Amino acid sequence: SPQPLEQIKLSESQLSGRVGMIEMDLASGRTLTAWRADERFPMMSTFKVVLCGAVLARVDAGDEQLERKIHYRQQDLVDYSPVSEKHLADGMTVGELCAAAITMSDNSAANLLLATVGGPAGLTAFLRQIGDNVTRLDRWATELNEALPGDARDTTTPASMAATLRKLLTSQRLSARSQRQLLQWMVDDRVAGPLIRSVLPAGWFIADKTGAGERGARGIVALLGPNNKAERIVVIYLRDTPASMAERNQQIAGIGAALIEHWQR
Numbered sequence: 001s002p003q004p005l006e007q008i009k010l011s012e013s014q015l016s017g018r019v020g021m022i023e024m025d026l027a028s029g030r031t032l033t034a035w036r037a038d039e040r041f042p043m044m045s046t047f048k049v050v051l052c053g054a055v056l057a058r059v060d061a062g063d064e065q066l067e068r069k070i071h072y073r074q075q076d077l078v079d080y081s082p083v084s085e086k087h088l089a090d091g092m093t094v095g096e097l098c099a100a101a102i103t104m105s106d107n108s109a110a111n112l113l114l115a116t117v118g119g120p121a122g123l124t125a126f127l128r129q130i131g132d133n134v135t136r137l138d139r140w141a142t143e144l145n146e147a148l149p150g151d152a153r154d155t156t157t158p159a160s161m162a163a164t165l166r167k168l169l170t171s172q173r174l175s176a177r178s179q180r181q182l183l184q185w186m187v188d189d190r191v192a193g194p195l196i197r198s199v200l201p202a203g204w205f206i207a208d209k210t211g212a213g214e215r216g217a218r219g220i221v222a223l224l225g226p227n228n229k230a231e232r233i234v235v236i237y238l239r240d241t242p243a244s245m246a247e248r249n250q251q252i253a254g255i256g257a258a259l260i261e262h263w264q265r
């Protein structure tokens with residue numbers, strides 16, 4: 001594979017779309033690669049990680065408990081609820097809801113959680129409170145990935161998302177236990193985690209949340225590194241490409257391969 005930046009360019013050329021990417025040291029925030037890092041991209045399902053960071057903040061403040069059981073109704077379910085559709089009789093705890101939203105991308109779980117933090121506006125206010133003045137959530141789980149051109153709703157920038165994830169995971173804004181919980185939820189991703197490990201060389205750590213939307217929208221927020229360490233945050237978003245899901249997946253994997261082969265920069 002070529003250098004990361006050359007591979008990113010090849011991906012835009014092959015996809016006919018825009019790629020946005022940031023590679024950042026998790027411990028220090030050192031930016032290694034930045035391409036269209038200040039441009040907007042639909043967050044898609046990656047918003048679920050920020051969502052649970054807001055939930056954890058409420059737990060830390062004593063305004064929420066991960067143990068609290070929420071009972072909901074079938075009428076509350078939206079498209080794609082693999083875990084939540086199984087608990088109409090007994091409910092789910094707030095912590096189980098975050099695990100379902102992040103590790104399974106359960107949309108009903110995400111919407112139930114979103115209501116607890118004040119809806120899209122409340123999550124956006126939380127983002128402003130931690131210093132992210134760019135990322136914005138405007139719609140609920142099954143409408144936020146429409147990806148209309150020129151539509152600023154439900155978007156982030158690679159730089160903003162990377163900085164925000166770093167703040168949630170390492171800045172002590174969240175308690176030690178909450179930081180550890182948010183990280184473990186990403187380590188536990190069932191949607192893409194196992195697949196990524198299957199193609200990663202031995203020794204590489206992965207934690208992640210992926211997303212997909214219309215007009216080719218695709219993305220991943222991840223922690224990656226050799227020696228089984230979460231050394232860097234890598235955020236990659238794709239938008240406005242008519243390519244098949246397989247090819248968008250392949251191009252993102254290709255950027256990952258360039259990173260893996262040329263890690264020491």
Ligand SMILES: OC[C@H]1O[C@H](O[C@H]2[C@H](O)[C@@H](O)[C@H](OCCCCCCC3CCCCC3)O[C@@H]2CO)[C@H](O)[C@@H](O)[C@@H]1O
Pocket residue numbers: 001196199200201220221222223224234235236252253254255256257258260261
């Ligand atoms: O020399 C480095 C490595 O080169 C190859 O590894 C390949 C691997 O066989 C392939 O499957 C992967 O594809 C990349 C898979 C990436 C999957 C997703 C990565 C995510 C993670 C973070 C966010 C963006 C993308 O590339 C590496 C590097 O060429 C060799 O197989 C391996 O033995 C060797 O140690």
Ligand SMILES: *C(=O)/C=C/N[C@@H](C(=O)O)[C@](C)(Cn1ccnn1)[SH](=O)=O
Pocket residue numbers: 044045046079080104105107141142145191210211212213
């Ligand atoms: C988050 O990015 C969600 C994207 N796609 C979802 C959806 O729109 O709700 C579906 C259900 C695919 N999916 C399942 C699990 N992760 N993604 S839709 O694109 O089929």
